[PDB]
């Protein structure tokens, strides 16, 4: 419990914990962490069978092994052949807002399982969505300069809001569990297709699989650490 | 030194070749297990020896350079605060992080962070921090260094307690 787990990335500050006894047991949420408030699963569980989820009462395994099983809040509601299109839809619905952003949907392809979470208490953060729906080049962040202009347009006027971004499938909320099934780009710049010796050395973008991109890495930090200047040149403790 | 930094960078770049080859080797099933050890145990063993040799040689290169004017070096030569390990982490490579004597574990399924791909045992993935404090750490290097950091804080708490009772 007091050790800094990998799955704490982006959700809990890696630096702000108290020395002593409470070390690692008292944590602090990172700047962009949020916690699910809870949603009713009925609608989803309904949509699910409308979309081909075979009821468990009629499931015969030796007769369809390749089937993927679906769970909602821990309940095994059923089985579904060709879950791929259901998942496409589920994500589209959530990116519209017809399914609450707060809802976590994960598809473990190798494990033949699709799990949905609607309960409260799940910690999540927001990430840039990256899809190749863009013809012109390759895979890109769905947020473009035109969007940012509107954002800043509404700033300066002190109406394009954070919610707008969510509604237009530009950003998504993601919990540790779903975080398992995605590949995240650190800088939106390593989505690109004689070096300053003073800079720190970085690794490559050998990824044509990016599904998301960090809004900004300095956001893994909590409030206290967000006040330290150049925390990345300091010794950890 | 401008040149020293080039020498240091290549010194590590060399360790990532040695480690990359031990991988292709092991991925081909050519590595031979050392009696009383798993392939994976001796695999790790070598990558850790490689990386440390790098860290070390990267540190000496930085040590050698510093002139006598160098104040950090002047403190060291006299005895007051500061060691090789300190100069090395500030100037040359910071080193390899680690929790419980091993490289950063696959917290997520088959990966250290969601930014890597599964089954990536490279040094960048598993916790080696190439950069020095001077150059700054990358987000991944930063988290991994915090994981290692926390381990120390934790048992500084323990070590603290357990010794005040033993002494009594």
């Amino acid at each position: 419990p007091r050790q800094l787990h990998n799955t704490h990335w982006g959700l809990v500050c890696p630096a702000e914990t108290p020395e002593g006894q409470a070390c690692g047991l008292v944590k602090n949420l990172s700047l962009m962490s949020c916690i699910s408030v809870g949603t009713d699963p009925m609608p989803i569980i309904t949509f699910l069978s409308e979309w081909g989820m075979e009821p468990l009462e009629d499931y015969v395994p030796h007769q369809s092994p390749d089937a993927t099983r679906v769970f909602v809040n821990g309940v095994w509601h059923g089985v579904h052949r060709n879950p791929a299109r259901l998942m496409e839809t589920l994500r589209t619905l959530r990116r519209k807002g017809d399914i609450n952003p707060e809802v976590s949907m994960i598809r473990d392809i190798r494990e033949k399982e699709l799990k949905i979470f609607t309960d409260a208490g799940r910690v999540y953060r927001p990430l840039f969505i990256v899809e190749d729906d863009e013809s012109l080049g390759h895979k890109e962040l769905k947020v473009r300069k035109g969007h940012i202009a509107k954002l800043m347009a509404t700033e300066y006027q002190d109406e394009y809001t954070w919610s707008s971004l969510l509604n237009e499938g530009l950003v998504e909320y993601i919990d540790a569990e779903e975080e398992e099934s995605i590949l995240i780009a650190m800088q939106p710049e390593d989505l690109e297709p004689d070096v300053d010796p003073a800079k720190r050395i970085r690794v490559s973008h050998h990824a044509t699989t990016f599904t998301h991109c960090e809004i900004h890495p300095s956001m893994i930090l909590g409030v206290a650490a967000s006040i330290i200047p150049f925390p990345d040149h300091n010794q950890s403790p | 030194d401008g040149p020293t930094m080039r020498e240091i960078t290549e010194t590590i770049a060399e360790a990532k070749k040695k480690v990359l080859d031990v991988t292709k080797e092991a991925q081909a099933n050519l590595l031979t297990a050392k009696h009383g050890m798993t392939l994976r145990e001796s695999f790790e063993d070598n990558v850790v020896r490689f990386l440390n040799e790098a860290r070390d040689k990267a540190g000496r290169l930085a040590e050698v350079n510093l002139k006598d004017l160098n104040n950090v070096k002047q403190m060291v030569m006299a005895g007051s605060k500061g060691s090789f390990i300190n100069i090395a982490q500030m100037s040359a490579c910071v080193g390899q992080q680690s929790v419980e004597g091993k490289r950063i574990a696959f917290g997520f399924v088959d990966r250290t962070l969601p930014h890597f791909s599964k089954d990536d045992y490279s040094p960048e993935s598993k916790g080696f921090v190439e950069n020095s404090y001077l150059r700054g750490l990358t987000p991944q290097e930063f988290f991994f260094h915090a994981m290692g950091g926390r381990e120390g804080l934790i048992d500084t708490a323990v070590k603290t307690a357990e010794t005040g009772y033993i002494q009594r």
């Binding site: 010794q235 950890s236 403790p237 | 850790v48 990386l51 440390n52 860290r55 390990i85 982490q89 910071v94 080193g95 390899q96 992080q97 680690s98 929790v99 004597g101 091993k102 490289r103 260094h145 994981m147 290692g148 950091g149 381990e151 120390g152």
Partner: peptide, 8 residues
């Protein structure tokens, strides 16, 4: 901090 056979 440093590496294996050293501190974390």
């Amino acid at each position: 901090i440093w590496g294996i056979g050293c501190n974390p």
